[PDB]
Amino acid sequence: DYQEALLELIERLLRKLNVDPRDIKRIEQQLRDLDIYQIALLLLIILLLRKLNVDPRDIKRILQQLIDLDIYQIALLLLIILLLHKLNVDPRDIKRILQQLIDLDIEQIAELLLRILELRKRNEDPRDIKRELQQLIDD
């Protein structure tokens, strides 16, 4: 069962992040209702936040918000935060940006990702890409 295997990796990561076991149980229960694409993408986002040294309680809170999104939203968010890390955006800023993106609808997120990619292709400076993304989010 590939879903169960992926769920066990998530449970292991949450334990290594000192997430309260009571919260792990409630999270695991919610994850068991998602499809395998959502579960795998959520695993990746956890791995990325862990790589950025995001505080465990913040990872837990962010995960709980992401569990309510569909595969398309979760995937596009992963790509955005991967690009922001590549551009050396401070993890504290990536965290705050991710919290804002979660409330946006899928069309806006897809448009933002395209915009970031367009600007990268145009050789725009990392700080300019961050500032423009932050401005488009506030809009």
Residue numbers in the entry: 2 to 140
Sentences from the paper on this structure:
We determined the high-resolution structures of five designs from C2 to C6 symmetry by X-ray crystallography, cryogenic electron microscopy (cryoEM) or both. The crystal structure of C2HR1_4r matches the design model with an overall backbone alpha carbon (C-alpha) root mean square deviation (r.m.s.d.) of 1.54 Å. C2HR1_4r has a large repetitive interface composed primarily of leucines.
Here we describe a systematic approach to generating modular and rigid repeat protein oligomers with coincident C2 to C8 and superhelical symmetry axes that can be readily extended by repeat propagation. Repeat proteins are composed of an asymmetric structural motif that is concatenated several times in tandem within a single protein chain. From these building blocks, we demonstrate that a wide range of unbounded fibres can be systematically designed by introducing hydrophilic surface patches that force staggering of the monomers; the geometry of such fibres can be precisely tuned by varying the number of repeat units in the monomer and the placement of the hydrophilic patches. All multiplexes follow the naming convention CsHRN_Rr where s is the cyclic symmetry, HR stands for helical repeat, R is the number of repeats in a single chain and N is an index to differentiate between multiplexes of the same symmetry.
